[PDB]
Amino acid sequence: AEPGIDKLFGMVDSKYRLTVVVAKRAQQLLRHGFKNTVLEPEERPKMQTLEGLFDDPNAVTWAMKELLTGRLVFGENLVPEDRLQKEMERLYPV
Amino acid sequence: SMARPVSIGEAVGIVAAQSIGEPGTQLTMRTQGLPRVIEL
Amino acid sequence: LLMGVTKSALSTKSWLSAASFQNTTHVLTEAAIAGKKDELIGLKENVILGRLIPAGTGSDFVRFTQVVDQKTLKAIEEARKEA
Amino acid sequence: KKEVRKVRIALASPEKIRSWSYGEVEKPETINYRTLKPERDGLFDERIFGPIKDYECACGKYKRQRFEGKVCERCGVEVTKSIVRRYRMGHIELATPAAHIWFVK
Amino acid sequence: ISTSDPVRQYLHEIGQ
Amino acid sequence: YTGRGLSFLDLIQEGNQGLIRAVEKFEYKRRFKFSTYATWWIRQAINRAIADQARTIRIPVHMVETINKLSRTARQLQQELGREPTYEEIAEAMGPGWDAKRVEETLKIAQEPVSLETPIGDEKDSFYGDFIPDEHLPSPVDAATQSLLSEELEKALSKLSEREAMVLKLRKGLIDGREHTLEEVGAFFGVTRERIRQIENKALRKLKYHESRTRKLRDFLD
Amino acid sequence: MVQVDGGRFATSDLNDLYRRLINRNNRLKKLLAQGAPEIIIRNEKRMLQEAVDALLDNGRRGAPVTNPGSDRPLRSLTDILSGKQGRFRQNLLGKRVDYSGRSVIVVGPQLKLHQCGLPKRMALELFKPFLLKKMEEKGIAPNVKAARRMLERQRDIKDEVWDALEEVIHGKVVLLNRAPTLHRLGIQAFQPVLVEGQSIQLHPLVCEAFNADFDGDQMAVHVPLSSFAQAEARIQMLSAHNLLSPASGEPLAKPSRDIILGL
Amino acid sequence: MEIKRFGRIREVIPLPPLTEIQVESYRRALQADVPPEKRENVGIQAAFRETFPIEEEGLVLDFLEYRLGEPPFPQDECREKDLTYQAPLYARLQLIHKDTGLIKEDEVFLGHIPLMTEDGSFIINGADRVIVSQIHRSPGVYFTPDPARPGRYIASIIPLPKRGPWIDLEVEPNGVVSMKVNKRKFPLVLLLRVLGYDQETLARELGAYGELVQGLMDESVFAMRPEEALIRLFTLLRPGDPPKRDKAVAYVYGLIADPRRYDLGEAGRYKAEEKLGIRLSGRTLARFEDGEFKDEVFLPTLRYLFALTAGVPGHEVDDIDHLGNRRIRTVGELMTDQFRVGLARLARGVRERMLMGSEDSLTPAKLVNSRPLEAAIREFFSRSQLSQFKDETNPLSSLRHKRRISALGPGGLTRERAGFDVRDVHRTHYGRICPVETPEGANIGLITSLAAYARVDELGFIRTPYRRVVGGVVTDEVVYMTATEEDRYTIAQANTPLEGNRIAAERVVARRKGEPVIVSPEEVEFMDVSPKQVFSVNTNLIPFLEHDDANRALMGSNMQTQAVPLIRAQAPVVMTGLEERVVRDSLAALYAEEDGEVAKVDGNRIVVRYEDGRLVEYPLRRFYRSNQGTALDQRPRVVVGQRVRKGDLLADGPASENGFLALGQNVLVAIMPFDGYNFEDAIVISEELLKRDFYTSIHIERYEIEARDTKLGPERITRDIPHLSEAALRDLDEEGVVRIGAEVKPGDILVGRTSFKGESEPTPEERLLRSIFGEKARDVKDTSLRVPPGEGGIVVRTVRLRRGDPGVELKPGVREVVRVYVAQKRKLQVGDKLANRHGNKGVVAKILPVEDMPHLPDGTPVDVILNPLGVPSRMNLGQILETHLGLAGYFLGQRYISPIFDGAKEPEIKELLAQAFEVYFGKRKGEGFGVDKREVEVLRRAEKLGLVTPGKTPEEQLKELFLQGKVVLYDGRTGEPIEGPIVVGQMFIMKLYHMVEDKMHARSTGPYSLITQQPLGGKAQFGGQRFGEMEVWALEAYGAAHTLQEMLTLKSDDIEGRNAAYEAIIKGEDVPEPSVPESFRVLVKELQALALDVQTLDEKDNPVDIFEGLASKR
DNA sequence: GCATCCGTGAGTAGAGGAAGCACAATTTAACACTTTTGTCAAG
DNA sequence: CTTGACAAAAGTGTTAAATTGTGCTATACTGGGAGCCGTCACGGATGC
Ligand SMILES: [Mg+2]
Ligand SMILES: [Mg+2]
Ligand SMILES: [Zn+2]
Structure with a gap:
């Protein structure tokens, strides 16, 4: 099973809300090129390539691990979508 | 499927229909068996 | 009936x-x-x-969820409530 | 722009049916047996349902997007995308009325 | 004659 | 006349039209009974209707008569030779001006289209339309490579000067969709015909140089 | 009215009905213009009504209209929109999809509950756009077109393509399906494992839910594309997450014949 | 390998020719060798004598004789050139002008009749085909009980299919006996009056029963003239047609008295005569002679109905499923019926031809147009349901396909309509139709197989043989009887003990009318010939059949057909005795005609010098491709100078070893679980099988392409292909076709063809590209033939046909066609399907090295590992006995023949196992080796399990285990023994036609449909997977909304969506949001074509345009 | 309360699939013939 | 950049010619050819 899947299910009132949060965080990570992550350098997911260990390109794993960390806030009617995107662009250029 | 309170937004009608209809092939046919369920 | x-x-x-x-x-x-x-x-x-479909992740109950990290959320709130 | 929220079905009046159509089909001819091009006023007429290929009239005088939304005077075929051939309907003017079998049988 | 058969109906009509 | 493309009632109505024509043209002075003169018109109307309405792809009357004569000759040769005749025999029997090529072309013309809803096999879940690909709309790969070519060509034209790029994109029809001419492009910039031919050639040579130094554009040529 | 590769013409049955209707309408117009008697006009109007009925719904009233030279009734609009082979059940409620494969299944005892054995060639064909992008990223190919031409011919494929493919599928999952899909666990998400061969390896514990043994069964493979699709497959549809039966609540992935015997 | 035989039943007759049902029927139909004056009136001759003479009422066309010429081309030429192997048919006709009285005679070509090969198949358009026999209700008179009313019976008169209406006679509650014809009911009194029946006559004949006759004595019509009665009946049947006596009498005569339209077949006439106890003059319900109608069958059938209703002892109802009431139409009868309908069409063509055009100068050649007959024959042989593509994976496949019986087809039942009644095994199938053999699924009970000893008689009824028993001693007089005749005797069983020829047992198990009984030797009248007559040829190849459940013997017999020929195929160790006969009667091998000496032996030919002096050369079929792609070749089995007797084998056929059927291999099988690789029917095999080329087969694939004339120009098959490097053209010869012997992989070019590009201006970007590179666009484009994905092999043959070539008939517009044959030698791999004769099937899931397989104490590893958990649920215990006998024969080096239901029993197998142990353990003692420690541990554990007798020496305990078929088996990985003794033996296992190489398929993007724009289907079309309704239901149940939306729009028919998704994926971005499907747009447009205004609205009920403004009139 | 009409009946695969002739009217291919475009050369 | 030429591709009539559309044929002829039962069985709604 996915690591910490029980904790992920226990953090939300509906499993589909968990899926929505994971997918949205994955797309946020993909759009900004993984520069908006809340993961420390020792916590970034890695993959074993013939050359060596490199950052995992799968954003869903990154989103799940970040949600496991607990530094993400999710909910409904937090911030306006346009303002959220504009601020995320400003802090994290892409 | 999870032994916990159902999450809001689940398509319980489709699950109900599938659960009822899956063991239909195991019901006897030879007012008894699958015809009984069909008339009910 | x-x-x-x-x-x-x-x-x-x-x-x-x-x-x-x-x-x-x-x-x-x-x-x-x-x-x-x-x-x-x-x-x-x-x-x-x-x-x-209006079921699962397509239901109105969960479809509008928003996810945001600490830093950007603090930026959005501080740069607006300062007024 | 706006999202589809409802789908309504209703009867179509003769006026509405004529408003849908881009032209009346007057001949049963489909295509020419030798040139394989659609026959005028037929079931596959270009002057009614649109051009066969994008931005090109039947007479081959307009062949680029520059003259978009135009109708060639020589052939009458509108210069637009050929995909409109999937979306443009025609109509047949009956000499006498004919009942719809759905509302009879 | 036969309402559902057009040929028989036409023949009956022309036989009058 | 049944079994030749038209239903019985259609033949009856076409014969009715012929009968109306016969009544219009009949003369009773000659003392011939009506049926003798009306039969000609009825048969004429029925035959013309069959020649005009028995095929999805309409064929002219003279060509229909030619096809019918060819079929009759082929049947006669088939029943006389005790085998299916080749095109040479049929052409020889038809007469002067007929060869094997013309017979083959006539046979190819006389081919009726096949219905898209004809089932194949006992199972009633397969049709011809299920095996005919659509080759009009571009495939996703074709659209993707067209977009890639457009992007790479736009990035290649940036190295050109501001006017040379405009001259090339006008002469090649990258702006208005249609190619212009040196005189027509010259009117836009006020330049004469000859000068444009030289600046365009110079820009083309510069693009060739850049392509030779990068080779980022040779793959899209297939 | 399309022309097939061989040069022959193929057309639908609606054209014949339209031609019949148009011919009868024009002939009625001509007869009216000629002042024809009442019997002829009545017959022509009756034929016009019958042609309209055949076009709208063929076979509902009277003998079905058939193409001359055959006894197969022509396909009308009602036949197009109705039945098991109609528009709804054949093209709207179900469709054929891209990025889909199918192959014979064999048992993999070494796999984990969330893993499956996917043949290398099936993975190459299913993940082709991602593989081309990865090949472009590395030095394998200069651009996407060159990579696709390289993958066109089997003998032109080098050995780094397989390493790129292994890199591409990292984390992603695929949906395995066995027909008939009696219940919802007839489709399950598994993490692919590239294997040598041409048969899919299936975990023993998911056989009862799939109702799949190994005397010749086949299964279909589907590849979800976006982040929502991957998230749903990994979180909701994963095999290791659906352990209890939705119908009764009892375990459905549980020890089976050989495991029970050995214990 | 000496062959030991088991059994005690002495069979008195051999099996009949297994293909005689196909051969003799067609010989009777054609009668191509009988002299014209001695031909009997059946088949084609019957058709001519029925349709002719054609009379204009004064032109008469009369038929004298017909003949069949030599076929234009041989079978091989027809196969190569896609022709039909047929013979010309001419007819001799004479035209008589009754006015003048002059006869002109000439011979007219009536067409080509397809011919049947010596094996019993046809070559239609170059493809082998088989005409399947059809079982249906026999015509005649039947008397069934009315279900609505107890005590009421109804009479049914049934003619041949499409040869007259069914006639119903029913005693109405009012008492009047009503007659139903063509869905119309009427009083039978009227028709009886039409046929010249008074009142006193009916009282004199039908008045000895009771009140029933009173209901059929209406005097309001008795006095009325038969003329007026006939007109009244004519008006009643078809109402509206103006009453005329001529039309009325013509209609009645055509309905019940015209032999050309009503035909009570010979079987029907015989059944009616034997039931009603009458003698029919003809084969019609009534006879129209002397301007009056005369009754033939209505009075006797009404008498029988009345007496049945009364309840006299001699009358009983008819069972319509009784096999004496069901008959078989073979290829001959179906072909004759189609020939007759074509001849009737020709006759009507002649009739409306001789009524116009130079009446005086008419010759038979001008009047006869033979096209309708040829058309009907071609439709029957090409697009009939019973004319099926020949199944020739192996000779047994074709043999079964020829010996199959189908209740479907024209004039038969329906796959969906029929159920629970026609699909059952009736008691009369014993010895006539095989019960176990049938296709499981929607066709169960509808398609069956003819029994081994059964044969169809002239009338179409299946007969079975029985030995005559007189006075309690069984004689050698064999009588072939039908079910209706069989029901009159007490028939004993073939397993009854005999002391010579006298029945020794005091109690004999017999059958009376299908009911088992115990009788005395003096009550026995007939005896079964053998236990094989109850089962078909396919089922008779299963040893130890009595130990297998029927549901699994069905699977085994069905899968015997699907086995592919192997290059090292060997006959089974345990046989039933039919292998040699199956090979002999399939005509796949080559046998000597008479005694002689072999003069020349070669891989392509065998030349034999016979005693009479003639030298006969037999060519050998080498590497021929069957319909299923398998390789069918013959290997010589003689040497130069060898003396051969009559019937001796000269060359083996496909799937045969020295004349015995060889569908698989004999492998060393251990029955035990193995690390879960045996889980759920999976099979584990050793790598040693691949090392010595076991289960290796040769398959040949055909690729075809044609060059065509187009409007823009002719397609050229050339080696000069634009924009291709030299590597792609390396294997193409100067003609553009791949050279023979070249190894081809997917994507390689087989033949190079260029097609003229359609005139179309290019995009501006392409023009800029060509301007930059200075390359002028060509006029031809690559349209060559390449190897499809997952295919390839070695090019073995190329066939090139051109327009001017003799014999070939290319369709117009095609100049030439090129065919390429690619052969590949397939080895056993993971995913391939193996099976055995006892219904045990599974796919190979693992291939282990030789050092990992369990091995015997002497070091011999096993070849296959089978899971024991598949036996208890399936109850197929025959494989266990086969394994025991195979082990016994493996250590004794002999093969066995155990006939089904009379063969080897456990005591004999245990004696053989004792000898096998004495030769298996005595060698170890002779070599100076005692008892293994591991064996001692296994013996201790087995004695704890009660498998051996405590206190015995280790050798005796090992012998006991061996007598149980179990041996001490070691583990190849650890070296330690398996904790319990394992069942090891030798089993015959077949490799089936279902291979994973031909079933794997994947697709990213490809062709799309025309109207719906959805992906096509099928691996050949490179199509996608059908995501039906239940898959959508599963995704909805999971709550995966986005995955479902993707599969509905992005991956199926969202043109913009799919293009954008592909571009985004190849550009490294995420796929965009999907849009409206094109299928919904098609639905909306088709609903608008029905004058229905379908409109899509928004939140505020305002119209929303989903067509992007492409359908709005400005 | 009996006749009568009408709609429904599992999935995924595969592989095998019989008129002629005359004369006027409307395209169409060949032929010149004149601008209308690329080139070329210099200044 | 601007002039003045020149050869070739393209647009413009003109016409004999294939190609297509239309009309007429006068002994007398006057209401069709298929097609026919393992009819599929069971509900359901409607009309008498
Ligand atoms: Mg299975
Ligand atoms: Mg089957
Ligand atoms: Zn135009």
Whole structure:
């Protein structure tokens, strides 16, 4: 099973809300090129390539691990979508 | 499927229909068996 | 009143699902004469139109969830409440 | 822009049916047996349902997007995308009325 | 004659 | 006349039209009974209707008569030779001006289209339309490579000067969709015909140089 | 009215009905213009009504209209929109999809509950756009077109393509399906494992839910594309997450014949 | 390998020719060798004598004789050139002008009749085909009980199919006996009056029963003239047609008295005569002679109905499923019926031809147009349901396909309509139709197989043989009887003990009318010939059949057909005795005609010098491709100078070893679980099988392409292909076709063809590209033939046909066609399907090295590992006995023949196992080796399990285990023994036609449909996977909305969506949001074509345009 | 309360699939013939 | 950049010629040819 899947299910009132949060965080990570992550350098997911260990390109794993960390806030009617995107662009250029 | 309170937004009608209809092939046919369920 | 599954399904309010189940001609003629309007409440109608079904991750209860990290959230709140 | 929320079905009046159509089909001819091109006023007429290929009239005088939304005077075929051939309907003017079998049988 | 058969109906009509 | 493309009632109505024509043209002075003169017109109307309405792809009357004569000759040769004749025999029997090539072309013309809803096999879940690909709309790969070519060509034209790029994109029809001419492009910039031919050639040479130094554009040529 | 590769013409049955209707309408117009008697006009109007009925719904009233030279009734609009082979049940409620494969299944005892054995060639064909992008990223190919031409011919495929493919599928999952899909666990998400061969390896514990043994069964493979699709497959549809039966609540992935015997 | 035989039943007759049902029927139909004056009136001759003479009423066309010429081309030429192997048919006709009285005679070509090969198949358009026999209700008179009313019976008169209406006679509650014809009811009194029946006559004949006759004595019509009665009946049947006596009498005569339209077949006439106890003059219900109608069958059938209703002892109802009431139409009868309908069409063509055009100068050649007959024959042989593509994976496949019986087809039942009644095994199938053999699924009970000893008689009824028993001693007089005749005797069983020829047992198990009984030797009248007559040829190849459940013997017999020929195929160790006969009667091998000496032996030919002096050369079929792609070749089995007797084998056929059927291999099988690789029917095999080329087969694939004339120009098959490097053209010869012997992989070019590009201006970007590179666009484009994905091999043959070539008939517009044959040698791999004769099937899931397989104490590893958990649920215990006997024969080096239901029993197998142990353990003692420690541990554990007798020496305990078929088996990985003794033996296992190489398929993007724009289907079309309704239901249940939306729009028919998704994926971005499907747009447009205004609205009921403004009139 | 009409009946695969002739009217291919475009050369 | 030429591709009539559309044929002829039962069985709604 996915690591910490029980904790992920226990953090939300509906499993589909968990899926929505994971997918949205994955797309946020993909759009900004993984520069908006809340993961420390020792916590970034890695993959074993013939050359060596490199950052995992799968954003869903990154989103799940970040949600496991607990530094993400999710909910409904937090911030306006346009303002959220504009601020995320400003802090994290892409 | 999870032994916990159902999450809001689940398509319980489709699950109900599938659960009822899956063991239909195991019901006897030879007012008894699958015809009984069909008339009910 | 009590009716079977077939009669109860054919007498639904949405003409798309009823037409896609059985008696397409009868359902369509009764809907066209009555000018019936389908509100797209169930799943078959959304499947036919290729829309997002109102179940699972497509339900209004969870579909509008927003995720945001600490730093950007603090930026959005501080740069606005400062006024 | 706006999202589809409802689907309505209703009867179509003769006026509405004529409003849908881009032209009346007057001949049963489909295509020419030798040139394999659609026949005028037929079931596959370009002057009614649109051009066969994008931005090109029947007479081959306009062949680029510059003259978009135009109708060639020589052939009458509108210069637009050929995909409109999937979306443009025609109509047949009956000499006498004919009942719809759905509302009879 | 036969309502559902057009040929028989036409023949009956022309036989009058 | 049944079994030749038209239903019985259609033949009857066409014969009725012929009968109306016969009544219009009949003369009773000659003392011939009506049926003798009306039969000609009825048969004429029925035959013309068959020649005009028995095929999805309409064929002219003279060509229909040619096809019918060819079929009759082929049948006679088949029943006389005790085998299916080749095109040479049929052409020889038809007469002067007929060779094997003309017979083959006539046979190819006389081919009726096949219905898209003809089932194949006992199972009633397969049709011809299920095996005919659509080759009009571009495939996703074709659209993707067209977009890639457009992007790479736009990035290649940036190295050109501001006017040379405009001259090339006008002469090649990258702006208005249609190619212009040196005189027409010259009117836009006020330049004479000859000068544009030289600046365009110079820009083309510069693009060739850049392509030779990068080779980022040779793959899209297939 | 399309022309097949061989040069022959193929057309639908609606054209014949339209031609019949148009011919009868024009002939009625001509007869009216000629002042024809009442019997002829009545017959022509009756034929016009019958042609309209055949076009709208063929076979509902009277003998079905058939193409001359055959006894197969022509396909009308009602036949198009109705039945098991109609528009709804064949093209709207169900469709054929891209990025889909199918192959014979064999048992993999070494796999984990969330893993499956996917043949290398099936993975190459299913993940082709991602593989081309990865090949472009590395030095394998200069651009996407060159990579696709390279993958066109089997003998032109080098050995780094397989390493790129292994890199591409990292984390992603695929949906395995066995027909008939009696219940919802007839489709399950598994993490692919590239294997040598041409048969799919299936975990023993998911056989009862799939109702799949190994005397010749086949299964279909589907590849979800976006982040929502991957998230749903990994969180909701994963095999290791659906352990209890939705119908009764009892375990459905549980020890089976050989495991029970050995214990 | 000496062959030991088991059994005690002495069979008195051999099996009949297994293909005689196909051969003799067609010989009777054609009668191509009988002299014209001695031909009997059946088949084609019957058709001519029935349709002719054609009379204009004064032109008469009369038929004298017909003949069949030599076929234009041989079978091989027809196969190569896609022709039909047929013979010319001419007819001799004479035209008589009755006015003048002059006869002109000439011979007219009536067409080509397809010919049947010596094996019993046809070559239609170059493809092998088989005409399947059809079982249906025999015509005649039947008397069934009315279900609505107890005590009421109804009479049915049934003619040949499409040869007259069914006639119903029913005693109405009012008492009047009503007659139903063509869905119309009327009083039978009227028709009886039409046929010259008074009142006193009916009272004199039908008045000895009771009140029933009173209901059929209406005097309001008795006095009325038969003329007026006939006109009244004519008006009643078809109403509206103006009453005329001529039309009325013509209609009645055509309905019940015209031999050309009503035909009570010979079987029907015989059944009616034997039931009603009458003698029919003809084969019609009534006879129209002397201007009056005369009754033939209505009076006797009404008498029988009345007496049945009365309840006299001699009358009983008819069972319509009784096999004496069901008959078989073979290829001959179906072909004759189609020939007759074509001849009737020709006769009507002649009739409306001789009524116009130079009446005086008419010759038979001008009047006869033979096209309708040829057309009907071609439709029957090409697009009939019973004319099926020949199944020739192996000779047994074709043999079964020829010996199959189908209740479907024209004039038969329906796959969906029939159920629970026609699909059952009736008691009369014993010895006539095989019960176990049938296709499981929607066709169960509808398609069956003819029994081994059964044969169809002239009338179409299946007969079975029985030995005559007189006075309690069984004689050698064999009588072939039908079910109706069989029901009159007490028939004993073939397993009854005999002391010579006298029945020794005091109690004999017999059958009376299908009911088992115990009788005395003096009550026995007939005896079964053998236990094989109850089962078909396919089922008779299963040893130890009595130990297998029927549901699994069905699977085994069905799968015997699907086995592919192997290059090292060997006959089974345990046989039943039919292998040699199956090979002999399939005509796949080559046998000597008479005694002689072999003069020349070669891989392509065998030349034999016979005693009479003639030298006969037999060519050998080498590497021929069957319909299923398998390789069918013959290997010589003689040497130069060898003396051969009559019937001796000269060359083996496909799937045969020295004349015995060889569908698989004999492998060393251990029955035990193995690390879960045996889980759920999976099979584990050793790598040693691949090392010595076991289960290796040769398959040949055909690729075809044609060059065509187009409007823009002719397609050229050339080696000069634009924009291709030299590597792609390396294997193409100067003609553009791949050279023979070249190894081809997917994507390689087989033949190079260029097609003229359609005139179309290019995009501006392409023009800029060509301007930059200075390359002028060509006029031809690559349209060559390449190897499809997952295919390839070695090019073995190329066939090139051109327009001017003799014999070939290319369709117009095609100049030439090129065919390429690619052969590949397939080895056993993971995913391939193996099976055995006892219904045990599974796919190979693992291939282990030789050092990992369990091995015997002497070091011999096993070849296959089978899971024991598949036996208890399936109850197929025959494989266990086969394994025991195979082990016994493996250590004794002999093969066995155990006939089904009379063969080897456990005591004999245990004696053989004792000898096998004495030769298996005595060698170890002779070599100076005692008892293994591991064996001692296994013996201790087995004695704890009660498998051996405590206190015995280790050798005796090992012998006991061996007598149980179990041996001490070691583990190849650890070296330690398996904790319990394992069942090891030798089993015959077949490799089936279902291979994973031909079933794997994947697709990213490809062709799309025309109207719906959805992906096509099928691996050949490179199509996608059908995501039906239940898959959508599963995704909805999971709550995966986005995955479902993707599969509905992005991956199926969202043109913009799919293009954008592909571009985004190849550009490294995420796929965009999907849009409206094109299928919904098609639905909306088709609903608008029905004058229905379908409109899509928004939140505020305002119209929303989903067509992007492309359908709005400005 | 009996006749009568009408709609429904599992999935995924595969592989095998019989008129002629005359004369006027409307395209169409060949032929010149004149601008209308690329080139070329210099200044 | 601007002039003045020149050869070739393209647009413009003109016409004999294939190609297509239309009309007429006068002994007398006057209401069709298929097609026919393992009819599929069971509900359901409607009309008498
Ligand atoms: Mg299975
Ligand atoms: Mg089957
Ligand atoms: Zn135009």
